[PDB]
Ligand binder design. Structure first.
Ligand SMILES: CC(C)c1ccc(C(=O)N=C(N)N)cc1S(C)(=O)=O
Ligand SMILES: CC(C)c1ccc(C(=O)N=C(N)N)cc1S(C)(=O)=O
Lengths: 509, 185, 509, 185
């Protein structure tokens, strides 16, 4: 057979798995350049609604022309599409904002989801009971496992829609922290009620074990993130000689912290962060300057392409993964996550503003509550729910899909004009200076003195103890790139000097 | 109850904040007669390790005297009291509050200056940088950083431009969040 | 169940596929730093024998402790481990060397493998017939399909063992070209005799179709490489606005040229090269300078890690993939590939030196013939041979494995002292200058004039026509990054100026 | 057979190379009387497009004469004949061969120079660079490239250092491969 051209034969059975993937990544890239090139579109749309629209458009072309659209799976997601986005977010982390805004970021997440989860659980239980035959029979635990999967704002969508608006650094870091720290209390209210579903009688001791489980899932997650952070810092000590393996000790040492902590069923999304904040101080130092411009400019490309892909995939999995429409339940979950979110935000800001320095202006509260977007961690967690244990997931998917579409479209195309109308401060900190840095550290040392004079042990005092600790015991046994003692003043001066010199040389004429 | 309302007006604290601060005052007095001097502050365990320890200890004091009374600790400490939007926009008559953003930067420029002559200078920047930075780092490198800051900052032309543009380069730095302290009740 | 810690449970069934892979890549990285740190080892061993030794050591620990070592498969190789190495080789291509040394590189490959393949076929047919019962019954075509899989020098091993020695740029480009262009005549003598095995009577017309098949597999391979090269150049024209997708238009536009040309069963290894030499002129220009230091410093890491992995994998697949030892056949294939290689080299250099400018000094001939290493494309092609069509692949693997070990160890640990003893010129061109570049282009233009004066239409005249062509019709419709007209003098000056300025600024003190 | 052995010794070609070159000579003569002049060379289709066309046409000629005979085309062309190792190391008496590496660089320095005064200069480099490069590129940018080359090359101190270090910076450039031509029989 194959008379003409004996060798030439179509082998599309080994290449199809990588060829389809390459085509999808190419579609992501082409759309990303497309809606940047077309003028004025970036204002009207949040540049992330069009990704979902294109996703469902190509899902309606793949379907309807005799091919089942590929339902973005769940674990080609937790492992392959999410780690880039999370490592991007937790690597380029404005650490001073967390260090000062830690109370709110750790109370808008730990007790700001553990509330919305139960709020939706309770009130959607109520609507389900009084709803009708089809909605009924869900029962409490099958509704708590819906509150806990729908009330988990996406570390993806919030950042992908708040990148373009350039909100005040405080408000932006608040949504950062909400989303990044949310998974620590979504993966202990999703693996806990699943085991509180079939566990015939709940008891009360098992709930105490649930609290201890949350402490483990959070603290051990951060601790594993640290342990593969004091090893990607201790391994980039030894790499003076081997210059071409630098862009890799940051990835296979965090993407192996995100898999040795999603293995144990800890929270990977936060262990990856904790391993993206213990590496940067000791991997920005002892590797060269071109390997670092590789790590940075590659993590940016990773995350940009991954966010584009998973938005195209929520688009292409809403044309073949949304069905079983039930009006009472869908409308109820919309209203009862929106009213839940805003009420939780108002309550917790009343609580916090009795403690923080810069009070949360009601503009802040409204852009937090209205700007907490739901994304693919609400879809890929409503897809791991097997149809055999929980016989109502024909409906959970359509509720999740309508909620994703509502908080990505109508809380996405409207968050743009909303900040303009409310006139919130927009990214005053666009550029960087040297006097900024010097005087900032002066004020930091001033407060570190004052707080200990008063006795008010707070953020600055702990920063002091930590910085003295990793200036004595670490940073001499972990960096060893001759930079064991150079303060941040000198390093910042060198960074700025290098940057301005490069820009001057580029401007040849 | 002791006399605390006049302090409460002059400073701007609440009542429990003042009570707790006076508690710390009594704890750190180590003797009624020596309410607060330089020696009392210097023996606080940690600030002496901080590079700016001596500057702060000499910064509370109004003048060359080496006593500080409780009311003064409050006058010099209120400068860190967090700025409150409603209570600053309620009545606008004069810069009565000691935590207005102008004073929160005047405190910094008074920490920089050798004497209260309103003169930041290459000597002052070099001294403070060699304080914050260790002693091992190169000296004319410190000079490079200091003179780079002098050049970029000084629009006066005398290399000083001590305060007016000091504020101008700090406006990009939110000091309301940065240099203020919430004193727990 | 799981009384203590309700959530915490070991889920090693979804992470195992990426976790094992991450562990293997980490092993590659750790060994690579290890035998660079340990002193003086880099001299004694070729730093690529130790990779195979560690591969078989961990294969003897994985085995013997109750676990089947993972046999480096065949298509986790053609698609995932090879494209990085080939794109590295064909991106950082010293193009002037190919343009002048094209005759030899295209005749040490097209008719320098099509000879060794048939030489081994014939003489190993002879030994098989007179060998004994076990060796016998192979038959001609089952031996031509061994000559064609063993006589395909690896674009991997040759470069990975000639990187450290720093041979004369001419000799190094000769081994470059041999290996890169070899696959164009290995994938038409491996898919041709397989179809000449079961094709009952060969005829003679089918051989003519074989020659036309070779022309297609080569020319169409390069043509597909070009077509996805005038598209990764035309797509990096439009990417002025989108700065974070630059490091990607070079990969998914070549790794989609290597899969749209391995699909058709063309030669991917050479289509990837042709798409790595039509992109660099028009993707080094119109993208920024940090995206380029990302592409370059990431391709280097790709290739370094991929070569380390596939050497560790030839190590770990020789402890569980080599068996059925047959002395007469193994010794015969050793002697009859070595004597075949050296004889083919001597013959073809006698042929060539009647045409080339700088004659191939017998030092060159001996380091070519003795330095043509066999690597994983000889193993992963002796593993695609099914045990049902060809009932002698218990033996082909052990012959291939002994040959890989011979040409990677004894032609690997000895090529190091061999060049020292023969005293061959070693990398005179370590550094770079400006006067070099200016006068080089002057001499190039001088010869371009002279050759047309004589009438001797040669390499320079074709370079002239091609350069005028892509200075008029291309480079104005393909670069459009304001660099549509800046000659290589200006670009080289800017590159050198940027480099020296960066180095001066780094040298703060 | 015409007289060709003396050319074969003076140049160093084989016999068929000379025959083929004379064939091209007859084809391009366009008239016996005008064997080779400037006009005959200028009308060759492609070299005139090449930036160095006029330099080459004026480079074959020995002196101000505007005739070239066949023997000279051979004398001026042999300079590109590939250097042959055995036939250059066989007998070492004198630099008889016209393709010795010294002559292969003296040809370049004679192409650079305005007149045969052995003086490369910023004028010469600037002229040749503006020849190779187009006319659109910035002029004092060309000056920057030229003076950078002058500074790095010139160890003489007069900015010229015309030939002796010319060879020194070219030694890193293998000219044996670079600037030689195999003339097909
Ligand atoms: C099974 C898959 C559906 C999954 C779900 C949730 C989690 C998690 O614990 N935390 C997230 N996703 N943020 C991990 C996974 S996994 C181990 O990748 O397969
Ligand atoms: C089937 C696999 C075993 C394979 C073998 C050979 C080739 C090839 O044609 N050229 C190479 N390898 N250089 C391609 C493949 S493939 C399409 O990746 O699966």
């Amino acid at each position: 057979p194959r008379k003409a051209f004996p060798v030439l034969g179509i082998d599309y059975t080994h290449v199809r798995t990588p060829f389809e993937i390459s085509l999808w990544i190419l579609l992501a890239c082409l759309m990303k350049i497309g809606f940047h090139v077309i003028p004025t579109i970036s204002s009207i749309v949040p540049e992330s609604c069009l990704l979902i629209v294109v996703g469902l458009l190509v899902g309606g072309l793949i379907k309807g022309v005799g091919e089942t659209p590929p339902f973005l799976q769940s674990d080609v997601f937790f492992l392959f599409l999410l780690p880039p986005i999370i490592l991007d977010a937790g690597y380029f982390l404005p650490l001073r904002q967390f260090t000062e805004n830690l109370g709110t970021i750790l109370i808008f997440a730990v007790v700001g989801t553990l509330w919305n989860a139960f709020f939706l659980g309770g009130l959607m239980y109520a609507v389900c009971l009084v709803g009708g035959e089809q909605i009924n029979n869900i029962g409490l635990l099958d509704n708590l496992l819906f509150g806990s999967i729908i009330s988990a704002v996406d570390p993806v969508a919030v950042l992908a829609v708040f990148e373009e608006i350039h909100i005040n650094e405080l408000l932006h870091i608040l949504v950062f922290g909400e989303s990044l720290l949310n998974d620590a209390v979504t993966v202990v209210l999703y693996h806990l009620f699943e085991e509180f579903a079939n566990y015939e009688h709940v008891g009360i001791v098992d709930i105490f074990l649930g609290f201890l489980s949350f402490f483990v899932v959070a603290l051990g997650g951060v601790l594993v993130g640290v342990v593969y952070g004091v090893i990607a810092a201790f391994t980039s000590r030894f790499t003076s000689h081997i210059r071409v393996i630098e862009p890799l000790f940051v990835f296979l040492y965090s993407y192996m912290a995100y898999l040795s902590a999603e293995l144990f069923h800890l929270s990977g999304i936060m262990a990856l962060i904790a391993s993206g904040v213990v590496m940067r101080p000791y991997v920005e130092a002892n590797i060269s300057h071109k390997s670092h411009t590789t790590i940075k400019y590659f993590l940016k490309m990773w995350s940009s392409v991954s966010e584009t892909l998973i938005f195209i995939f929520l688009g292409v999995s809403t044309v073949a993964g949304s069905h079983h429409w039930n009006w009472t339940f869908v409308i109820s979950t919309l209203l009862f996550c929106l009213i839940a979110r805003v009420l939780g935000v108002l309550g917790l800001t009343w609580f916090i503003n009795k403690f923080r320095i810069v009070k949360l202006t009601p503009k802040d509260q409204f852009i937090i509550a209205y700007g907490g977007l739901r994304g693919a961690i609400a879809f890929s967690l409503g897809y791991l729910l097997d149809k055999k244990h929980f016989p109502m997931c024909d409906l959970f998917l359509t509720a999740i899909i309508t909620v994703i579409f509502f908080t990505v479209f109508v809380q996405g195309m409207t968050i743009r004009p909303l900040v303009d109308l409310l006139a919130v401060k927009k990214k005053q900190e666009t550029k960087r200076s040297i006097n900024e840095e010097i005087h900032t550290q002066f004020l930091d040392h001033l407060l570190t003195g004052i707080e200990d004079i008063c006795g008010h042990y707070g953020h600055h005092h702990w920063k002091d103890k930590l910085n003295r600790f990793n200036k004595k015991y670490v940073k001499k046994c972990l960096i060893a790139g001759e930079r064991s003692k150079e303060p941040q003043l000198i390093a910042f001066y060198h960074k700025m000097e290098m940057k301005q010199a490069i820009e001057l040389v580029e401007s040849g004429g | 109850d002791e006399e605390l309302e006049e302090i409460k007006k002059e400073t701007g604290f609440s009542h429990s904040q003042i009570t707790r601060l006076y508690s710390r005052f009594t704890s750190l007095d180590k003797g009624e007669n020596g309410t607060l001097s330089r020696e009392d502050f210097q023996r606080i365990p940690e600030l002496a390790i901080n590079p700016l320890g001596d500057r702060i200890i000499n910064a509370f004091f109004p003048e060359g005297e080496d006593q500080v009374n409780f009311r003064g600790f409050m006058r010099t400490l209120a400068h860190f009291r967090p700025i409150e939007d409603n209570e600053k926009s309620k009545d606008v008559n004069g810069p009565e509050p000691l935590n207005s953003r102008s004073n929160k930067l005047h405190f910094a420029f008074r920490l920089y200056d050798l004497d209260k002559d309103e003169k930041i200078s290459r000597d002052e920047l070099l001294q403070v940088l060699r304080m914050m930075v260790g002693v091992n780092i190169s000296d004319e490198q410190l000079g490079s950083i200091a003179d780079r800051t002098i050049q970029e900052a000084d629009q006066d032309g005398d290399s000083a431009a001590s305060f007016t543009e000091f504020v101008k380069v700090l406006e990009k730095v939110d000091v309301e969040q940065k240099m203020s302290i919430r004193f727990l009740h």
